[PDB]
Design a protein around this ligand. Structure first.
Ligand SMILES: CC(=O)c1cccc(NC(=O)N2CCOCC2)c1
Length: 435
């Protein structure tokens, strides 16, 4: 695998040992061959699991998720997918790694897609080797891959709202269930219904994942209600997955606004990763996968691939050259390589709106490309009446940095800034000048 100009897809089935058995063998061989190596974890939770798998090997943990005193002599670096892309975008030297290892390489967040595009372009240039570790590479069509033990697959109507009757099988179960929902708001309603029925529920989403995931180890629970973030190498001691088989799709309308379309079917890759949370113990056959819909290739036209192009257009590669998306995922967007390349000061603004502003890539791009500076929040208030953000069926209001109460009416509307109470709270703080 370790030869320059090689990209290997390590596509062993979920639970086959890619992280705990194969990765340490790859790292030992890379160190023997003096390959400057990066290992990319999708989440801080996976970063910590990797430290355990790699313990004693000379690896530099570029993450506060691990508390280890480093020698200063490591040639292997470990960081999150997002950290890799972030450092490429910033005016910081990222080593030209000889070997690029991406764990949970199916991750479809924009920074992960961009990282794959940059890495696969360096490999195509003859500059580097790469290993993408995933059971479900891009365009996989198999929702039911092999497992460590047999899975009971059942197509069944799955509730997406509170229920009073007609789903006894949900609550009649005595084991532990991981339940994939399409949104935080949908999980909140199901979680409340289960809580009312006497169940112990933990909810996981991107913003809460590290903190709340620890509760799955520290407390007894009956259900984990999770969004798609638990597709990325989250492991549970569970005997059932309930899968809505639904997700939200960010869609850019008319180059002008982003909506969260759906819920709509998941991809085959997502369905396989959701299912792959169970059947992992060869000694515990008959784990259950209850699924409530079909699969479809809903990554086609999904904003994350256009956002990945916005990131890659703003990463230096060589002179004016621009990294391509990884070939198998390159048709998911209609985009011209370089169309989103920003001049130096607008690029800095773009980066800060993502890094400090915590804005979605698309929205950060609209603001930066309009020639607005990072601290200028006038655009949060001067949109059309139809861009009014609503909070409990009334227009959201904030005090501006000038001390004026105004309706939140952003010039560019991206549904991700108000997808749930926590998102809208964060965006209100942004509009107010509080970060
Ligand atoms: C984003 C982030 O957390 C980050 C970013 C850059 C560097 C590091 N830390 C290191 O380079 N390590 C670990 C600490 O002490 C020895 C060297 C962490």
């Amino acid at each position: 695998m370790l030869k320059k100009k090689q990209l290997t897809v390590l596509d062993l089935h979920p639970g086959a040992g890619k992280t705990r058995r194969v990765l340490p063998e790859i790292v030992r061989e890379a160190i023997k061959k003096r390959l400057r190596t990066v290992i990319l974890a999708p989440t801080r939770v996976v970063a910590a699991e990797m430290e355990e798998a790699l313990r004693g090997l000379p690896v530099r943990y570029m993450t506060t998720a691990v508390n280890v005193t480093h020698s200063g002599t490591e040639i292997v670096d470990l960081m999150c997918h997002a950290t890799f892309t972030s450092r490429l975008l910033q005016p910081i030297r990222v080593p030209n790694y000889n070997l690029n290892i991406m764990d949970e390489a199916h991750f479809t967040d924009p920074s992960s897609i961009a990282a794959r595009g940059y890495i696969s372009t360096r490999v195509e240039m003859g500059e580097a080797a790469a290993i993408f570790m995933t059971a479900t590479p891009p365009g996989t069509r198999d929702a039911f891959p092999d497992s460590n033990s047999p899975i009971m697959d059942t197509e069944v109507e799955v509730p997406e709202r509170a229920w009073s009757s007609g789903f006894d099988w949900v609550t009649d179960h005595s084991g532990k269930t991981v339940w994939f929902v399409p949104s935080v708001r949908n999980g909140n309603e199901i979680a409340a219904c289960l809580t009312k029925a006497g169940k112990r529920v933990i909810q996981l989403s991107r913003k809460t994942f590290e903190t709340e995931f620890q509760k799955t180890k520290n407390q007894e629970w009956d259900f984990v209600i999770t969004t798609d973030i638990s597709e990325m190498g989250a492991n549970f001691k569970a005997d059932r997955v309930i899968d809505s088989r639904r997700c939200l799709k960010p869609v850019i309308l008319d180059g002008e606004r982003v909506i969260l379309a759906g819920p709509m079917p998941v991809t085959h890759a997502s369905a396989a990763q959701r299912r792959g949370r169970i059947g992992r113990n060869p000694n515990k056959p008959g784990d259950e996968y209850m699924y409530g819909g079909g699969c479809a290739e809903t990554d086609e036209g999904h904003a994350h691939w256009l956002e990945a192009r916005m990131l890659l257009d703003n990463i230096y590669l060589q002179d004016g050259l621009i990294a391509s998306l990884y070939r198998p995922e390159a048709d998911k967007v209609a985009a011209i390589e370089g169309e989103f390349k920003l001049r130096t000061e607008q690029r800095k603004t773009f980066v800060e709106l993502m890094k400090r502003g915590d804005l979605p890539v698309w929205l950060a791009y609209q603001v930066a490309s309009a020639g607005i500076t990072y601290t200028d929040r006038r655009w949060c208030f001067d949109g059309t009446t139809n861009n009014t953000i609503m909070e409990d069926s009334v227009p959201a209001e904030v005090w501006t940095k000038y001390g004026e109460k105004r309706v939140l009416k952003p010039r560019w509307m991206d549904a991700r800034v108000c997808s749930d109470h926590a998102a809208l709270k964060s965006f209100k703080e942004f509009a107010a000048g509080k970060r």
